[PDB]
Amino acid sequence: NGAIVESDPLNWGAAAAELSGSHLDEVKRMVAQARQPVVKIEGSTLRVGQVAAVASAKDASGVAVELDEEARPRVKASSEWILDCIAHGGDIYGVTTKDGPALQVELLRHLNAGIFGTGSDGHTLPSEVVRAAMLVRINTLLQGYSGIRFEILEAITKLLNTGVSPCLPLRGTITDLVPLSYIAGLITGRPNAQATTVDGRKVDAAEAFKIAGIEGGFFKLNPKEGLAIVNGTSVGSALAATVMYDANVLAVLSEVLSAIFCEVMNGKPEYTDHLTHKLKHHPGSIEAAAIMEHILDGSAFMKHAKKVNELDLKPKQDRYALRTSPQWLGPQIEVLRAATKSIEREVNSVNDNPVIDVHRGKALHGGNFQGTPIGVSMDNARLAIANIGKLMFAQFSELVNEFYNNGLTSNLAGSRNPSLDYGFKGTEIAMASYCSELQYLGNPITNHVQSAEQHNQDVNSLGLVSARKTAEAIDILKLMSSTYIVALCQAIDLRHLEENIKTSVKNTVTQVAKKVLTSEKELITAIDREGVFTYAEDPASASLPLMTKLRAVLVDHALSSGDEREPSVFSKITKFEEELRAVLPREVEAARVAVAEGTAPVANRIADSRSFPLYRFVREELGCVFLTGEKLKSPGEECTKVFNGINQGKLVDPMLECLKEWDGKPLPINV
């Protein structure tokens, strides 16, 4: 044991130091670790990216688990200390009677209290979580304070690296004796112990040892080794860790997605100005705003939107889902970072009781098994996740609403005829069902603590139960992200189509006017003020805005000045309108065709924007196509492809690619 740290005796400063860097750098380190093919553990450096790497891998071929051999002496030392103290009399108050081996057998028999159902009707712990738990369980035994044989740690490592996962019940822990006893029960060859192989085949304990390559037969546990395995917070903390990996990734995604939302909405980028957020001090919103500011500062959509600021005073301010999104996301990210550190401390902790302190020569009893950090962190992170989801729902709701999305189509429909294309109306309903259930999951579990086990456990953390609900919350947030991403790419394509149609209408009107009316500048202006999609389905219609406003322009000029006056009216009705009705529908149609074939005169502004890597990922890597009632593809098929892309880890790289040019600093304001 070391000495008291004079400059930081209670460890507040070292925990605060974990939070001193930027969130993005922390996420980048995290994902890089999850991509490493080796996880080497020694009891003090395990991070949530590494737990996620092992949980999503099937065996060593995806990620190999390695024990650090420099941990062997301290592990052995506390194992031998138990054995020597036994030989020369006895002592250990919590470990030692008359039959020692019988006590380790009974310990596991009565903690095997789980209900497995049929094994496949929803009452077993997923093997992904079993694996994560085995990893954390090993890591939290390598500090040398547990009194367990290194050889047991090596055998659990073989289970991880060959993909033999013991079968654990889904429920039964208030945080983790019961689920962990089924790992100890496989290690000891209990007759009811089972496991599954990489390929999903169910096997008994002896077949599991053969498949994993464990030699020497079943282990017979020494007095403290039973408690060392089953007594601990390994299951709750391990699930919490894989959840916090997904949470950090999706928190960054909602920052990027908020910037793309602004691009397709033609929002004013001023809401990201550093001064606004520096004056509130909150680092979460400062980083959120700088991240959006970076994307928007390299956006071709925004250079195009300022060109519209020159010839637009009946405009309206942006809504909160856009204008306050840094203020909204910042506090969620701050909470998620603190929960990550709490969990990362817990997966590097000694949480088995009693503690074997060889330096002072005593077994130290306490409460290191109380997984409060897991339950507190999971409850806090779950509510932050729900607030992130609520923001995506509100942004989604604005984006698909014609009254609010600044010239995009109703429901983001893409077809020539909106009467036979209701676009994302169905996905919008589904987004509300996601959001409602997510708000429900935002409720906490640690205010439902029961007085348990003869009222000996009158407080208990419920860590794993909380972690399970937060994992379900992450699932729903991934559903909302997938559907939102598809809608954003739809919006991008609609802006590309909008721009080319407007260009073709301007050229066409200019041409006909010069040929018939030999004041163009004000005809062009009348076209800017009307949204393309209010007339593009039938541009020649006299009851739609285009023809109605062009007529009104000419009628105004005539009525004011120029009484016959060279038969002014006849030039308006006959030549101009007739000529337009004849040429205009073919020109729009030719613009729609050029867009569809990738040969549009005005290139899609996404190609020149920092947000491009996400559009590319969806359109090229995943093969999702622009959605239109003229074809048969449904939005669910594209949402499903994105969702699976996210689960397989394929969105992380293009998400971070949006920010590859960012120096981690806000844009200067001082002058």
Residue that has been written with the tokens 């006299």 in this structure: 542
Between residues 100 and 531, which has the closer beta carbon with respect to ligand NH4? 100
Would you count residue 372 as binding a second copy (CB under 8 A)?
Answer: yes
Between residues 12 and 93, which has the closer beta carbon with respect to ligand NH4? 93
Would you count residue 173 as binding ligand NH4 (CB under 6 A)?
Answer: no
Q: Could you tell me which stretch among 19-27, 105-113, 187-195, 414-422 binds a second copy (CB under 8 A)? A: 19-27
Between residues 59 and 334, which has the closer beta carbon with respect to a second copy? 334
Asked if 376 and 342 touch (Cβ cutoff 8 Å), the reply is: yes
- List alpha helices for 529-664, DSSP H: 545-560, 568-570, 578-596, 612-616, 635-647, 652-657
How far is the C-alpha of 67 from the C-alpha of 138, rounded, in Å? Answer: 9
Q: Measuring CA to CA, how many Å separate 97 from each of 92, 101, 223, 355?
A: 11, 11, 11, 20
Binding residues with a second copy: total (CB under 8 A): 119
Q: Which of 353, 377, 380, 481 binds ligand NH4 (CB under 6 A)?
A: 353
Residue that has been written with the tokens 């997904």 in this structure: 246
Q: Which of 95, 391, 523, 639 binds a second copy (CB under 8 A)?
A: 391
How far is the C-alpha of 109 from the C-alpha of 554, rounded, in Å? Answer: 93
Would you count residue 104 as binding ligand NH4 (CB under 6 A)?
Answer: no
Site for a second copy in 419-478 (CB under 8 A): 439-440, 442-444, 446-449, 451, 455-460
Round the CA-based radius of gyration of the chain to a whole number and report it. 32
Q: Which of 61, 309, 317, 507 binds a second copy (CB under 8 A)?
A: 317
Collapsing DSSP to helix, strand or coil, 461 comes out as coil
Would you count residue 299 as binding ligand NH4 (CB under 6 A)?
Answer: no
Which of a second copy, ligand NH4, none does residue 101 bind to, with CB < 5 to 8 Å depending on kind?
Answer: none
- Phi and psi at 511, nearest 5°, equal -65, -50
Instruction: Dump strand ranges (E) for 110-193.
Output: 165-166
How far is the C-alpha of 197 from the C-alpha of 162, rounded, in Å? Answer: 8
- List alpha helices for 423-538, DSSP H: 425-441, 463-516, 520-528
Would you count residue 268 as binding a second copy (CB under 8 A)?
Answer: yes
Exposure on the CB side of residue 78, measured as CA atoms within 13 A: 28
How far is the C-alpha of 225 from the C-alpha of 148, rounded, in Å? Answer: 5
Q: Which of 48, 71, 257, 355 binds a second copy (CB under 8 A)?
A: 355
- List alpha helices for 400-462, DSSP H: 425-441
Between residues 456 and 543, which has the closer beta carbon with respect to ligand NH4? 456
Question: Contact letters (x/-) for a second copy, 49-88, by CB under 8 A?
Answer: ----------------------------------------
Which amino acid makes up residue 497?
A: L
Q: Could you tell me which stretch among 75-83, 183-191, 381-389, 414-422 binds a second copy (CB under 8 A)? A: 381-389
Residue that has been written with the tokens 């997984």 in this structure: 371
Question: Contact letters (x/-) for a second copy, 288-307, by CB under 8 A?
Answer: --x-----------------
Q: Could you tell me if residue 165 is left (phi over 0), alpha (psi between -120 and 50 degrees) or otherwise beta?
A: beta
How far is the C-alpha of 238 from the C-alpha of 61, rounded, in Å? Answer: 21
Site for ligand NH4 in 231-260 (CB under 6 A): 231
Give catalytic residues, as residue numbers.
Answer: 93
Would you count residue 666 as binding a second copy (CB under 8 A)?
Answer: yes
- Please name which of 216, 229, 224 lies closest in space to residue 166, comparing C-alpha atoms: 229
Smallest distance, ligand NH4 to C-beta of residue 228, A: 12
Collapsing DSSP to helix, strand or coil, 195 comes out as strand
Question: 283-297 and 23-34 are packed helices; what angle lies between their axes, rounded to 10 degrees?
Answer: 80
Residue whose beta carbon is closest to ligand NH4: 353
Site for ligand NH4 in 207-236 (CB under 6 A): 231
Would you count residue 380 as binding ligand NH4 (CB under 6 A)?
Answer: no
Would you count residue 504 as binding ligand NH4 (CB under 6 A)?
Answer: no
**What is the 8-class DSSP label of residue 357?**
E
Q: Which of 128, 246, 287, 428 binds a second copy (CB under 8 A)?
A: 287
- Phi and psi at 670, nearest 5°, equal -50, -30
Would you count residue 384 as binding a second copy (CB under 8 A)?
Answer: yes
Which of ligand NH4, a second copy, none does residue 72 bind to, with CB < 5 to 8 Å depending on kind?
Answer: none
Would you count residue 332 as binding ligand NH4 (CB under 6 A)?
Answer: no
Asked if 638 and 627 touch (Cβ cutoff 8 Å), the reply is: yes
Would you count residue 32 as binding a second copy (CB under 8 A)?
Answer: no
Smallest distance, ligand NH4 to C-beta of residue 238, A: 20
Q: Which of 116, 218, 320, 422 binds a second copy (CB under 8 A)?
A: 320
Under the rule (CB under 6 A), what is the footprint of ligand NH4? 231, 353, 369
